[PDB]
């Protein structure tokens, strides 16, 4: 009862990407904006994460680690949710001043990826996900990707993850009645969570390549963005950091 009150109170607010919606849609313009929105959205995730119960009792090193590995999956999941309640999953609502339409998806040279994220949005509708179920799932996403060897203090991490997995169970169970719909529901939500990883990986690779040849494509990468994508992302695409799926 108290847990849900927290996630709702610490839930970040609207964030603008600062895109010049008066300039012809181009690869450089759109991407440069997305990177900026990523920088702005990142600052809020850090604050949001700190407010997360138990997050503070995590080794400072792991705190910055988990954040640098799941920031992508978290932002996408939230974007899809916004796209679902803002445009009915019609388009991708990255930001109030950065709404992606069919045309912009192609102009971004990542139409296939946008198509996958859009499905995620539609998923929120088909499964009738509730704001409460969403809030918790997003929180669980924070502890859904860690290095293979483990964290500085894997002990506390597993304990926290276990508690959030239980919180998700509570939100569901504390509304149903029969022991049948409770399982099937937990199954669907856990499935929805894993479907985010594949999408995040494709975005990890795309942003990676973009960074490499960002000098010739005229795409600006903020400080934090370029540092995480050049140090953290590689570990993910190399196998160092692997997501934590519920199902095989």
């Amino acid at each position: 009862p108290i847990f849900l009150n927290v996630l709702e109170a610490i839930e970040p607010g609207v964030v603008c990407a600062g895109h010049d919606n008066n300039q012809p849609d181009s690869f450089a313009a759109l991407l440069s904006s997305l990177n900026e929105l990523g920088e702005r959205q990142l600052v809020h995730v850090v604050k949001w994460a700190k407010a997360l119960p138990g997050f503070r009792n995590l080794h400072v090193d792991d705190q910055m680690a988990v954040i640098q590995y799941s920031w992508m999956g978290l932002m996408v999941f939230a974007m899809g949710w916004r796209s679902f309640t803002n445009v009915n999953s019609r388009m991708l609502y990255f930001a109030p001043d950065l709404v992606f339409n069919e045309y912009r998806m192609h102009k971004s040279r990542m139409y296939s990826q946008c198509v996958r994220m859009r499905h995620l949005s539609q998923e929120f509708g088909w499964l009738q996900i509730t704001p409460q179920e969403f809030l918790c799932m997003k929180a669980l996403l924070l502890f859904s990707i860690i290095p293979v060897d483990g964290l500085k203090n894997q002990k506390f991490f597993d304990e926290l993850r276990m508690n959030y997995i239980k919180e998700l169970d509570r939100i569901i169970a504390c509304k149903r009645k029969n022991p049948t719909s409770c399982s099937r529901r937990f199954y669907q939500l856990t499935k929805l969570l894993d479907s985010v990883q594949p999408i995040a990986r494709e975005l990890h690779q795309f942003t990676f390549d973009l960074l490499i040849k960002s000098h010739m494509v005229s795409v600006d990468f903020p400080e934090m963005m370029a540092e995480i994508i050049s140090v953290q992302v590689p570990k993910i695409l190399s196998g160092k950091v692997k997501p934590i799926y519920f199902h095989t």
Binding site: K50, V60, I67, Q68, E223, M224
Partner: peptide, 10 residues
Amino acid sequence: LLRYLLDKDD
């Protein structure tokens, strides 16, 4: 400077 964000004060 993510650490800078990690340990701000207010």
